[PDB]
Symmetry: C3
């Protein structure tokens, strides 16, 4: 069975200097089935991904059961599968100055995307959850000696709160050229009525020149070094009636290289029916940074 859903948005966006019209529409194909013993299986991808979904680069395929779910394709990484990301600000998701996303190292469309189809395993039992993920250590089916990437996370919900932790590791095929990167994450999610609060603290080590490239700095002509980093952040959103207001603030401090605090503030008004007016503002504290902002309508079909 194949079900269709879709979305669209339109409005105006300020990129720091000019306003521009911004719009889009997408269509999602969700396919499902149950085997005779009650195993579930399915697949989904958006229409603009038809081509990569046909090679396993985009879209995901899965099979679940009493043993947990195995998913393959552009599967999220284990930590991000359990904890997700922060309040999404702006109708276009105002990612320009850093975004609402938690800086997960692996999985998805993140640092490991070249590796795809990656595999995600997840399993819950009552109030606990575990997730583990990895590439094959080759570039999909072309047996390329590469990035072996992997992650593990686990959570525990106790009433109102989930708290969890995860570990992500990216192995370098030539550490004289690229240090291995690793990160440890702790996250705590709390819902109190119409308010959601999500907070995280991650720490680990990054390859020097990847870290210098994050902040847009030329690399240094030397062998690879690992620098230490710690990241952390918070979003709060609440809904009153049909109005949600929310924001987030996060910091990345990569030691010996630079520090940035980035943030955003947004609001939505639900017109009911699948449409809402959404608008937002995000920025960070580095040097250049010019706020971006937007305002428009978002539609779910």
């Amino acid at each position: 069975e194949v079900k269709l859903s879709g979305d669209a948005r339109m409005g105006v966006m300020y990129n720091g200097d000019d306003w521009n019209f911004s719009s889009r529409s997408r269509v999602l194909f969700t396919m499902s089935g149950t085997t005779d013993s009650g195993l579930e299986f399915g697949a989904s991808f958006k229409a603009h991904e038809s081509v990569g979904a046909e090679t396993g680069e985009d879209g995901t395929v899965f099979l679940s059961g009493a043993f947990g779910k195995i998913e393959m394709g552009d599967a999220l990484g284990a930590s991000e599968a359990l904890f997700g990301d922060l309040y999404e600000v702006g109708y276009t998701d105002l990612d320009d100055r850093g975004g609402n996303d938690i800086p997960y190292l692996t999985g998805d469309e993140r640092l490991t995307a070249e590796d795809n189809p990656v595999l995600l395993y997840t399993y819950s039992a009552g109030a606990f959850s575990v997730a583990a993920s990895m590439s094959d250590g080759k570039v999909g089916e072309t047996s390329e000696d590469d990035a072996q990437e992997m992650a593990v996370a686990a959570a525990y919900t106790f009433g109102n709160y989930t708290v969890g932790l995860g570990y992500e590791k990216i192995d370098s095929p030539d550490t004289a050229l690229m240090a291995d990167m690793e990160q440890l994450e702790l996250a705590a999610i709390a819902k109190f009525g119409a308010t959601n609060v999500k907070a995280y603290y991650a720490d680990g080590e990054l390859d020097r020149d990847f870290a210098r490239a994050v902040f847009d700095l030329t690399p240094v002509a030397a062998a690879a070094t690992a620098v230490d980093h710690k990241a952390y952040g918070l979003s709060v959103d609440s809904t009153f009636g049909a109005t949600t207001v929310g924001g987030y603030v996060q910091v990345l401090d990569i030691d010996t290289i630079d520090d940035v605090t980035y943030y955003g503030l947004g609001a939505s008004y639900d017109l009911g029916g699948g449409a809402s007016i959404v608008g937002g503002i995000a920025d960070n504290d580095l040097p250049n940074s010019d706020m971006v902002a937007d305002l428009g309508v978002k539609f779910k079909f």
Copy 2:
């Protein structure tokens, strides 16, 4: 909600010299919704446009209400939104020698396409209609100082006839390189039973070397000059029973550069059910021009 429709055609086509098989199939995704106060909203794009529809280059998004409809994306331009184009000849739309389309300067996939998402506003009240359109004056969200393009049109239906007028203007970012282009259009549409008659007269001014490029002439190594042009044409089609016969003739006279009359004659036979046999013939009076022609079946699903 997401509805699917689609089309397909197949037959043989004569390009001036040889016959070739010609065929295609397309699928259109139409998505709709109503908000709690009865505002309508939607989005649509064809499957082969999944990629550009995801950036706002292809497909359109809209929101309508008592105030009129706002549409954003590859929106038609205001004049073309009210008056449309002439009898479509041939199963492949025999556009080779000039086509059935009225030479609108803006909107759509026309001279302004780079500008997209462009915006179209339309509003009717009883028997009158207004439409206005424009780009943002940037290249979508990449704030590129460019083509500010805009148009306005209005119509009035009085029984059997609509008559209307429109104005289209394209501003040059460096008039020493490209003159501004403008056009004024008047159109009159009349339905008399099973006969439709559409006629227009447009006039204005074009950039010299754009006009020379239309007729496929090298440009002249000089600063930009505007040349004056006037365009006009007519189509008539009628249906008897299951057979429609129709044609059009149009002329473009760009002063000091060249004149062309182009035309076409076609017929359809409806097999009922969404299929019809369609065939046609088009040509113009320039020098080379070898008639193109075709014959095949067209299918709507």
Copy 3:
């Protein structure tokens, strides 16, 4: 009317040296309609082919009736339309070492693919079938003097068996550069309960350097020569309960150039519901050849 179906698979694949995750998902658009006298017409293409299906390179359009079916697009060639191919081994279709496909010269995505939309005509009456196919002798609608390719096949079912024959011919536009290629095929299909047996014998002549390129050999700096070849093979599959086991073996002997025998063995277990576990092994006898193999699940929606 537009119906959606789709498929997906996931598992691990061994390419001769390494195992890799391999997965995909696809969506097929099938569109149909009946005219007032009961002619059927339709079109279909997969989502990842939206772009070529819009030019007639991918997907097919058709119109059938009492006269037979005419199909245009990426239509299969006449022989392959009647006889199909051998047991498909492996969840990814383990085509690496030669595959389960019978070496048809024309149609489809085979040697004639550049030619597409190609045309297929088929007609059955009781127990007999005929099929004929061809390109236009141009490169679709760009009138390119090329490959005129064509084929004819016919079959006869007598109870338990179909036996048939076909002829395929590819004409060279410069025989000093490329010999014409031709092939004659005989095939016999037999179903005995849950067992299917398919066998073929083809023979003809190939262009020398195409034949040398098949076996991956540099060509020889001389004018084109035709070499003679004969191909033949067999697959057997049977289902016991929910387990199907099957395999095939085929040989290509191109005279004065090289001989290869290629084969594969696979099995499926049906989980019911559209999912099955499939796995397989294929290889050939040339020199390098390292077996490929796979194991995973396949899903139909």
